[PDB]
Amino acid sequence: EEKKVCQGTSNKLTQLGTFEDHFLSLQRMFNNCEVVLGNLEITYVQRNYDLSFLKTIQEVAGYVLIALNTVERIPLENLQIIRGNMYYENSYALAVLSNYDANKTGLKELPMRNLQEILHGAVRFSNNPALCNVESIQWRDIVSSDFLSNMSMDFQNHLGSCQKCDPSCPNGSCWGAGEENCQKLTKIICAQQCSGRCRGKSPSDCCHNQCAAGCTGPRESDCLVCRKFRDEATCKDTCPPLMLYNPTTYQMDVNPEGKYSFGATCVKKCPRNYVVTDHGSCVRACGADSYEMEEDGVRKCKKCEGPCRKVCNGIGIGEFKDSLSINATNIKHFKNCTSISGDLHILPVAFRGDSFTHTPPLDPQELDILKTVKEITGFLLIQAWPENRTDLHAFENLEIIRGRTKQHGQFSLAVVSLNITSLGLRSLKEISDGDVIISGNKNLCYANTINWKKLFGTSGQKTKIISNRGENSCKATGQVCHALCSPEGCWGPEPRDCVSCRNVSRGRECV
Amino acid sequence: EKKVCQGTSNKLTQLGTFEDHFLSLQRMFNNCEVVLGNLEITYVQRNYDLSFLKTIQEVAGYVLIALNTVERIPLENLQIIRGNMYYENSYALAVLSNYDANKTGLKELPMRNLQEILHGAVRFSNNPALCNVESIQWRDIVSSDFLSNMSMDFQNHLGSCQKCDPSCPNGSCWGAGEENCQKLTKIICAQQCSGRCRGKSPSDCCHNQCAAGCTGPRESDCLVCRKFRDEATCKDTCPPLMLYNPTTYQMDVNPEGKYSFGATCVKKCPRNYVVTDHGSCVRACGADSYEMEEDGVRKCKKCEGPCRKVCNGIGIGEFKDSLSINATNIKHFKNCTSISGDLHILPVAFRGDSFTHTPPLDPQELDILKTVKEITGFLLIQAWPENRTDLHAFENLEIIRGRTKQHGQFSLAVVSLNITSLGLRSLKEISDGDVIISGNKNLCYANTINWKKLFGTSGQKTKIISNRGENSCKATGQVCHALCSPEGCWGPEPRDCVSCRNVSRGRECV
Amino acid sequence: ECPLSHDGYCLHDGVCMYIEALDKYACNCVVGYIGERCQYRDLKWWE
Amino acid sequence: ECPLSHDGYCLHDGVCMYIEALDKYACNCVVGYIGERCQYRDLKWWE
Numbered sequence A: 001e002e003k004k005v006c007q008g009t010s011n012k013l014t015q016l017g018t019f020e021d022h023f024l025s026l027q028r029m030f031n032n033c034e035v036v037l038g039n040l041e042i043t044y045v046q047r048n049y050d051l052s053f054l055k056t057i058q059e060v061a062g063y064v065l066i067a068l069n070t071v072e073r074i075p076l077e078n079l080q081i082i083r084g085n086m087y088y089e090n091s092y093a094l095a096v097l098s099n100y101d102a103n104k105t106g107l108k109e110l111p112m113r114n115l116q117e118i119l120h121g122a123v124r125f126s127n128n129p130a131l132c133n134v135e136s137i138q139w140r141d142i143v144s145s146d147f148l149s150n151m152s153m154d155f156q157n158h159l160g161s162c163q164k165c166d167p168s169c170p171n172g173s174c175w176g177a178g179e180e181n182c183q184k185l186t187k188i189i190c191a192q193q194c195s196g197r198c199r200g201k202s203p204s205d206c207c208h209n210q211c212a213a214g215c216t217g218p219r220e221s222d223c224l225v226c227r228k229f230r231d232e233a234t235c236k237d238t239c240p241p242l243m244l245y246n247p248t249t250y251q252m253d254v255n256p257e258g259k260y261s262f263g264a265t266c267v268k269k270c271p272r273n274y275v276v277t278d279h280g281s282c283v284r285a286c287g288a289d290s291y292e293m294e295e296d297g298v299r300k301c302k303k304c305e306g307p308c309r310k311v312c313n314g315i316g317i318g319e320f321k322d323s324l325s326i327n328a329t330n331i332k333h334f335k336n337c338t339s340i341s342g343d344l345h346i347l348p349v350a351f352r353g354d355s356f357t358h359t360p361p362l363d364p365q366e367l368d369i370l371k372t373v374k375e376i377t378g379f380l381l382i383q384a385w386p387e388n389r390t391d392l393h394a395f396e397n398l399e400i401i402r403g404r405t406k407q408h409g410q411f412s413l414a415v416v417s418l419n420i421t422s423l424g425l426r427s428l429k430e431i432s433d434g435d436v437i438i439s440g441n442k443n444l445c446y447a448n449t450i451n452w453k454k455l456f457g458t459s460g461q462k463t464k465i466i467s468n469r470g471e472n473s474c475k476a477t478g479q480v481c482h483a484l485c486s487p488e489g490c491w492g493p494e495p496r497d498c499v500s501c502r503n504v505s506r507g508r509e510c511v
Numbered sequence B: 001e002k003k004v005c006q007g008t009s010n011k012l013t014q015l016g017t018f019e020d021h022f023l024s025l026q027r028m029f030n031n032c033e034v035v036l037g038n039l040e041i042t043y044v045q046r047n048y049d050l051s052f053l054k055t056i057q058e059v060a061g062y063v064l065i066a067l068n069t070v071e072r073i074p075l076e077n078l079q080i081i082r083g084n085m086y087y088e089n090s091y092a093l094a095v096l097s098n099y100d101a102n103k104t105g106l107k108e109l110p111m112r113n114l115q116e117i118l119h120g121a122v123r124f125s126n127n128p129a130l131c132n133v134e135s136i137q138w139r140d141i142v143s144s145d146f147l148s149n150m151s152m153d154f155q156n157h158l159g160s161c162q163k164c165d166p167s168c169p170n171g172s173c174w175g176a177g178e179e180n181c182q183k184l185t186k187i188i189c190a191q192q193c194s195g196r197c198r199g200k201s202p203s204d205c206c207h208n209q210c211a212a213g214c215t216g217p218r219e220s221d222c223l224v225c226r227k228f229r230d231e232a233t234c235k236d237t238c239p240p241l242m243l244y245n246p247t248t249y250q251m252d253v254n255p256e257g258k259y260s261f262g263a264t265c266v267k268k269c270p271r272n273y274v275v276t277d278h279g280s281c282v283r284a285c286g287a288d289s290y291e292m293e294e295d296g297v298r299k300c301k302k303c304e305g306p307c308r309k310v311c312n313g314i315g316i317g318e319f320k321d322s323l324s325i326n327a328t329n330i331k332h333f334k335n336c337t338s339i340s341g342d343l344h345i346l347p348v349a350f351r352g353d354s355f356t357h358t359p360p361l362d363p364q365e366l367d368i369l370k371t372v373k374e375i376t377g378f379l380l381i382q383a384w385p386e387n388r389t390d391l392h393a394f395e396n397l398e399i400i401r402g403r404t405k406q407h408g409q410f411s412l413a414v415v416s417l418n419i420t421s422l423g424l425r426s427l428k429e430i431s432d433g434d435v436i437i438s439g440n441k442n443l444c445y446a447n448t449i450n451w452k453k454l455f456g457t458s459g460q461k462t463k464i465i466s467n468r469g470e471n472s473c474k475a476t477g478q479v480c481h482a483l484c485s486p487e488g489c490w491g492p493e494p495r496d497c498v499s500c501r502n503v504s505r506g507r508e509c510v
Numbered sequence C, D: 001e002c003p004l005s006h007d008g009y010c011l012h013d014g015v016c017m018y019i020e021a022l023d024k025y026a027c028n029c030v031v032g033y034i035g036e037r038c039q040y041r042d043l044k045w046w047e
């Protein structure tokens, strides 16, 4: 059914603060999580820390990194499958590395006795003394042929000592001692000819073609974890077309059991902010040869004539998957965009130049380029901005932030830590989804008066706008607008920065 | 590929003499393996030979066997009856009153291989002499959602036929020797099984996408595909040309995606069909959407706001029951250039049918068809005003697609006409299907059109026989050699020319 | 034998006829014509 | 410990370190910043 989900850290081998602070995060991140949308990296956990909360993890889409841990036992006893929608050091779905103490003793017990499927990628085990029994699991079953050819992993005996495995174990396989805590094959103990996985350690009563790990039954409804699309209680390869062909009339008919395709789940309707293709699937962008003329309240599109009205990718995607901030090197690629088809990261390093990525400091004047962006299909993050300027100008004509993608999976607009006197997004009229966070902006007023409850439309959108200037401390600088504008705040002082106007007005300004 | 035949669909009617009627029924099903349409066996006498029906492996529509005096019907190899259509409504298989006045008719019906009846119900009534079939428990042959509506009452007579080999299960048996026992594979299957099984064991059942039974337990080991046929496998839906990408929330190119054409999945669409973006070969673009082909293929986009007209064409939709354009609803052909279907100009229209309550057609209403540029299906004309000598209404007819054809063969058929000449000086293409022009007493010129160019599909022939004559028409008409280049002519007049000379023109060839 | 109704029913000189055996009407179409009402001319054959 | 190259690797006053055990270079980001180079402020927490 429905499982609790977490983004999943994704900053491998990096240490967040102190062994403890690092810990507090790992805990804050995965506590209660049942599915890990991104990655599961457990590193730097110490000698006597409680990683009990990991017993709730049933699946991880990306990969599982476990390296540099002194802790002794890791509770990932309930992990079932590792999709491997991403890799560590390339070609690694599960990378367990250097888990030793200066005393040569760290990780010892890895109860992953349910990890039965690793859809993609290879597993690597190297330099982890104390690791016991794990060196007995035959992965020819946990991993899939296509990779057990690139998976490096040898185990070394340690100075300590650990019991063996109960005589109930298969060909040895056992993630520890417990009770029947032995690797239970469901891929090899299968019969000559069976679709895919099996639960019958031999019988021809095996699992449905669409199932990873195993299946309580032989049907499509009785399965440990779905391999591809999860449609309600069933596992699907593709989801019910809104239109089925009719072999008799050589024409197309509508399908009652037809659903839309959102991610891996199969919805009845697409989220109000995603694009719905006539096909019947929810996407985050229309072709390079199309528009987005939302119609019956639902966004849709029609192909144009070849290259259409500018569609820039936006930091962090395709031609930018490696860049972490709009900067000189390639800001040029935003010359005449009216829509950024991704996110926008304006970071500090951009303005000071990263000598690590070989990029010259961004010319403040260049941000004027963006002054033509009208909408951002994803999220707009800004942790920096030119000094001698008090206004998010480049985004004066931004009118919509779709929030198809958000920061930390949560924020769609994030203006944090600037010295700007005000926002100035006086054109913004929509924040489709995601939360707005505006804080740490020393001398920024007016913000606490936006009535965002109108500027955006989706259940759950919050607004953490804290620690800025000071209301009862900014009225003194006359920095307000309450008089000529209206209840719906302002984006600045001037009569053109109003959110709503008293007595209809013209000139994109009011008076 | 299995040999396929159209299959007669003219229930209970008799085609001429009991013999003539046989010969036909023979000419149609001789060698067939798959009856795309219907299988109707009626009026076959006491000593005729219906052995050729031994090759029919499956019938798409329904199987009607009624009013026969023959004793043995060799539908031994029939395996499945789709039931795409029904007889008398709610019947995919109907064996009716097969007796001779002496209460002696159909006796044995060796359908030992009939195992599936996808859609519809079965019905048996008034068939003295029918043997064994009385024992067949169809609960296995038919689908649950239909047995409730399937009537069949067997009877007795002053005769008798041998019992059934005890080897037969619950007594069930269609015949005698040849282990004609009811090979049952449904009611005899492990509680938890996809669909039909080839065995009793929970490890002996077939793929959830098959009919009758299976050799293996896979998708490639099936007796007959339940829905679609992907190469040598059975599929529910066919490989999309596009697969959704969970991780990227975007659409990726076809895995091993195929286009849909009927119940078969092709790698490409028959050039004369419409290819949707979805990846299907359809005979007509829905909604108010154009049919502008671009990639050389006939895709079809929509046209801003209220597009144009959509003339269905005889035999479909509002005219599935109309069997020829006639005064009653000819009005629905006022202003349109594309007939989205077929066109039957039948003698009954012109003479008025007193059975359907339709007034004879006014010959001055075929000028209504002067606006038709193309015809997606086929053009059938078995009648045409006498006080006329040219197929005029179809002067501007430029193309006939042939997505559908008479008998499943001809896209252009003009026979039994008193016209001196066709008069199709616009026609430039006949996508597919054969063209037949015969029984046209004083019709000429036709024998020179060199159609090999007029149409574009493998194997298109042209039966133009017994019209007027080449050596006899030469007198009062015929030949055009002069103004009309060595190509030929759709008439004598310069305009009727097929190809002028030296670019010369002005609508004609002066 | 066919009702004033079914008069005309069988086109192309086909003769109408009552199938008392099933309580139904049908046509004994002329040689060369096919169809519940002999409405079509069996193209694929001759002339 | 990190080379002149990785000098500037970690942003927001993070310190680069050499994981001898895994022969790599990572960041000991100051509290509040996440990401391999500590590029993002942890918005979903404080200020």
Ligand SMILES: *[C@@H]1O[C@H](CO)[C@@H](O[C@@H]2O[C@H](CO)[C@@H](O)[C@H](O)[C@H]2NC(C)=O)[C@H](O)[C@H]1NC(C)=O
Pocket: A348, A384, A385, A387, A417, A418, A419, D013
């Ligand atoms: C003006 O804004 C800049 C942002 O570019 C602030 O710069 C600080 O720089 C130091 C060292 O470079 C960083 O450690 C801080 O994180 C930056 N500030 C913050 C909290 O973002 C600078 O503080 C501002 N100047 C003023 C008015 O004090």
Ligand SMILES: *[C@@H]1O[C@H](CO)[C@@H](O)[C@H](O)[C@H]1NC(C)=O
Pocket: A027, A028, A031, A032
């Ligand atoms: C998750 O972590 C918090 C951190 O304070 C802790 O209080 C809590 O007990 C943990 N589990 C729960 C109950 O969510």
Ligand SMILES: *[C@@H]1O[C@H](CO)[C@@H](O)[C@H](O)[C@H]1NC(C)=O
Pocket: A090, A091, A146, A147, A150
């Ligand atoms: C392992 O194989 C994969 C292909 O499955 C390849 O992409 C990867 O780079 C290989 N690992 C290395 C670096 O040898």
Ligand SMILES: *[C@@H]1O[C@H](CO)[C@@H](O)[C@H](O)[C@H]1NC(C)=O
Pocket: A138, A140, A171
């Ligand atoms: C046990 O597993 C090993 C490794 O996969 C294999 O070589 C061996 O043959 C298996 N034992 C049997 C045949 O049951």
Ligand SMILES: *[C@@H]1O[C@H](CO)[C@@H](O)[C@H](O)[C@H]1NC(C)=O
Pocket: A315, A320, A322, A323, A324, A325, A326, A327, A328, A329, A330, A331, A332, A357, A359
């Ligand atoms: C910005 O800087 C990055 C640093 O790696 C560079 O690769 C990228 O192409 C530049 N383009 C942008 C985001 O303007």
Ligand SMILES: *[C@@H]1O[C@H](CO)[C@@H](O)[C@H](O)[C@H]1NC(C)=O
Pocket: A336
């Ligand atoms: C975008 O810039 C280009 C180049 O200057 C210009 O031709 C175009 O008109 C601008 N946007 C549009 C389509 O108005």
Ligand SMILES: *[C@@H]1O[C@H](CO)[C@@H](O)[C@H](O)[C@H]1NC(C)=O
Pocket: B026, B027, B028, B030
């Ligand atoms: C019937 O089959 C025989 C043998 O193939 C063939 O000679 C005959 O022509 C067939 N009937 C017709 C005329 O279709």
Ligand SMILES: *[C@@H]1O[C@H](CO)[C@@H](O)[C@H](O)[C@H]1NC(C)=O
Pocket: B089, B090, B149
């Ligand atoms: C019998 O059942 C069929 C199955 O759909 C239905 O179409 C029909 O109307 C029912 N009654 C008749 C007409 O026999």
Ligand SMILES: *[C@@H]1O[C@H](CO)[C@@H](O)[C@H](O)[C@H]1NC(C)=O
Pocket: B319, B321, B322, B323, B324, B325, B326, B327, B328, B329, B330, B331, B332, B356, B358
């Ligand atoms: C021809 O007559 C049928 C009834 O037999 C009627 O439904 C139809 O409208 C007529 N055809 C035309 C021209 O629509």
